[PDB]
Amino acid sequence: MKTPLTEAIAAADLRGSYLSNTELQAVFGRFNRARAGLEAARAFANNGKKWAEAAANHVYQKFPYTTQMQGPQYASTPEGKAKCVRDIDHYLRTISYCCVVGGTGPLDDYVVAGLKEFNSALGLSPSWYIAALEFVRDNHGLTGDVAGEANTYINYAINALS
């Protein structure tokens, strides 16, 4: 998919040559920030399923109608709530993959590609997810560079969702 290593290779294959000094540095500098990304994906691994229920509750208080209205595509029934915690988890799960890969590759192919065509065709709304996604961005409470990597990809999903 998309990653600075896989990307730098593609931009070299097009030229029909090896990697340039300008690219060698881009890949060399990738491994330098790699440790922070892996530690970020390690944080989601543990308390990642927990943020799912936490964010699922946040969205209910932001938008009360999601848990009271009819039953076509809302979290009114207990069955629909299980899908809300599920959907939020898929976001957090994919975001951690971006930290391991060091690029927005996972989000690009997994959640972003085909985002709108699906949501705005099944009645689902972006505002529900963005709201519960902004929640995690604040409550995850990571350190420094580990929090930097996590946020760069948490907010990215928010940009595509808007």
């Binding site: 896989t6 290779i9 890949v27 440790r35 892996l38 994906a41 898929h90 799960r93 391991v100």
Partner: protein
């Protein structure tokens, strides 16, 4: 196209589960020896021309029939097309050492290369011999003690060897 990391991520998504702790440590090892991995990728890039030239020279010295009037590789047209091909294999081998994954080589190169050479009348067992010689050199160059910090970039040679061997088998 996939790399050493993006491949494990793909394996994690297929089960709908995060990357386990033991998997975070695995890729953590890949990053720890990245400097050695890059030196390997950089020594092959530099000595690229030499490797494919000698691999060609030794291959014609081992199989003179193929490169003479009658053989498949005669004519300047085909003579330069043989070097060029070896150069291709080496380029993608280098790409794989960078990515830590063999996907780029399998798709962009090895994909239908077996049928190609076949539909053109190329020995195949000659191309594989050109890659095996191109390997001997690549290992000697990429693993030279002079000019580099001393250490054990061992698992890189084994991996380098698996890439060359993979390419040679995919044509013979």
């Amino acid at each position: 196209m996939l790399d050493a990391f993006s491949r494990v991520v793909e394996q994690a998504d297929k089960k709908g589960a995060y990357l386990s702790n033991d998997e975070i440590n695995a890729l953590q090892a890949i990053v720890a020896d990245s400097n050695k991995r890059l030196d390997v990728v950089n020594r092959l890039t530099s000595n690229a021309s030499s490797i494919v030239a000698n691999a060609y020279r030794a291959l014609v010295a081992e199989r003179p029939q193929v490169f003479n009037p009658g053989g498949p590789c005669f004519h300047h047209r085909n003579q330069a097309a043989c070097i060029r091909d070896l150069g291709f294999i080496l380029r993608y081998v280098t790409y794989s050492v960078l990515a830590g994954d063999t996907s780029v080589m399998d798709d962009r190169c090895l994909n239908g290369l077996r049928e190609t050479y076949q539909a053109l009348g190329t020995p195949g067992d000659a191309v594989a011999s050109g890659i095996k010689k191109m390997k001997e050199a690549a290992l000697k160059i990429a693993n030279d003690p002079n000019g580099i910090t001393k250490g054990d970039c061992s698992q890189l040679m084994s991996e380098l060897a698996s890439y060359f061997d993979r390419a040679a088998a995919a044509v013979a």
